[PDB]
Symmetry: C2
Subunit: 125 residues, 2 copies
């Protein structure tokens, strides 16, 4: 069959607050974001297409995914390698190299270590 407005019997036949739209012989559901199926029964797996980059963990949530980034990465898809050289950390005209969740200073001659702190022209004795 059958001629009836399924949207007017009582409870909403569409799950997860979808909008019920009557048709002749059936009905249709206008689903909210993140829900699928004839009656919006399914919570879509937003992680199914592997959106999280750089070995991030994908969290399948309500109408969205969340990425948990590997250290040193950021962004919605963990697509951004954080720039550790942004604060220009190298002393004495050292050159900063960005790495993963860290930086490297390329010190000029006569200077060492991590931040080029040690003056070796200073070894005056």
């Amino acid at each position: 069959a059958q001629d009836v407005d399924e949207c007017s019997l009582g409870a909403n036949p569409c799950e997860h607050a979808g909008k019920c739209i009557n048709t002749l012989g059936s009905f249709e559901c206008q689903c909210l974001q993140g829900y699928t199926g004839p009656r919006c029964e399914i919570d879509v797996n937003e992680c199914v297409s592997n959106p999280c980059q750089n070995d991030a963990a994908c969290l399948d949530q309500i109408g969205e995914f969340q990425c948990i980034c590997m250290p040193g990465y950021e962004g919605v898809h963990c697509e951004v390698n954080t720039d550790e050289c942004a604060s220009s950390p190298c002393l004495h005209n050292g050159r900063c190299l960005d790495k993963i969740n860290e930086f490297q200073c390329e010190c000029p001659t006569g200077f060492t270590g991590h931040l080029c702190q040690v003056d070796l022209h200073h070894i005056l004795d």
Copy 2:
């Protein structure tokens, strides 16, 4: 010429406290470590043979050299890459990888970041 004991005239003809040994027609100097030359005049350059490894700075000193190591290296010749994994820093059965003046933790599934602190099996909600 000439017949004379150069070691008995007065001052020591050998520099840098070398031992004066008389010979017929001359004399010879028995130099202390780090000195060379007929009269021990020269302070040997202990850095001449490039003893300092891994881009270390060589200091030419009295009868010895000293190496100034690049960060993460140690030893007389800076030949030792310091083992940062010695203290077993990785939490939750993470695997430690030794690097230069740093370490990397290879976390098992469900754990992140530097020391594998973050439990993601814990994202219970």
